[PDB]
Amino acid sequence: ARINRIFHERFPFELVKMEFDEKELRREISYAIKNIHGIRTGLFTPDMAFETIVKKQVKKIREPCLKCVDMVISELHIREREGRTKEQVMLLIDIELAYMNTNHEDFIGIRKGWLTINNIGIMKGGSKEYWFVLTAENLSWYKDDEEKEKKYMLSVDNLKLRDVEKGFMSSKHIFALFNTEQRNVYKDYRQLELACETQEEVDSWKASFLRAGVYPEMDPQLERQVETIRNLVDSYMAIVNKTVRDLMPKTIMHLMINN
């Protein structure tokens, strides 16, 4: 049975092969919102945009759960018991689809790093380094990784993202945050041309800014609704994986091995 225990701790590997294309998840969230409103208008995000995307991904779990039962039967009347152990695995998944419990270990119940300001004003020299935290809502500056100072901030929206021309440092690739409707870019430091340690870091920052909602150098509302639903789905599917990992061995131990 030290082989069986590997299954109970190899089954977690099958549950992470269930890959999906992100742009297909966003596509289905969008069509879900539109079909839920119907003829009406989108004042608030509907619940079924969350419930029906989650219910769709949970149904994918039936397969690996029934693989786990077959593997354990290989290691081990045992056939007649297989007819009863697999009902309780299907019936446990059905129960997961019957009700959506949002009261625990859920949101209801994005990028960090050091950035250097390349352009320095008349009152300062060298370069200015600060600890930067990016969220989907706002930008914040700090003097250290402890994130205690809370001195400068920028809005994710009403802001634009751009690359830079030739002449900027190549050893510390520089991007820029800027506005065109305002002269002062959220306590601007000479157009906020910020250097990173590597070019890959800049690209990752640009991706995070775009995800947050920074405009590159239905859509305004639908994209925010799609993003909100996507994050809520991920957090709730983390719960569903923990429950399945911890309930499969006990269902097999009770119904098959101990009998």
From Swiss-Prot:
Post-translational events: Phosphorylated by CDK5 leading to synaptic vesicle endocytosis (SVE) activation.
Domain PH positions: 110-214
Subcellular location: Cell membrane; Membrane, Clathrin-coated pit; Cytoplasmic vesicle; Presynapse
Known role: Catalyzes the hydrolysis of GTP and utilizes this energy to mediate vesicle scission and participates in many forms of endocytosis, such as clathrin-mediated endocytosis or synaptic vesicle endocytosis as well as rapid endocytosis (RE). Associates to the membrane, through lipid binding, and self-assembles into rings and stacks of interconnected rings through oligomerization to form a helical polymer around the vesicle membrane leading to constriction of invaginated coated pits around their necks.
Domain notes: The dynamin-type G mediates homodimerization and plays a role in self-assembly.
Disease: Developmental and epileptic encephalopathy 31A: An autosomal dominant epileptic encephalopathy, a heterogeneous group of severe early-onset epilepsies characterized by refractory seizures, neurodevelopmental impairment, and poor prognosis. Development is normal prior to seizure onset, after which cognitive and motor delays become apparent.
Family: Belongs to the TRAFAC class dynamin-like GTPase superfamily. Dynamin/Fzo/YdjA family.
Subunit structure: Homodimer; homodimerization is mediated by the dynamin-type G domain which promotes assembly-stimulated GTPase activity. Homo-tetramer formed from two dimers in the absence of lipid. Oligomerizes into a helical polymer that self-assembles around the vesicle membrane, when associated to the menbrane through lipid binding.
Protein name: Dynamin-1
Organism: Homo sapiens
Gene it is expressed from: DNM1
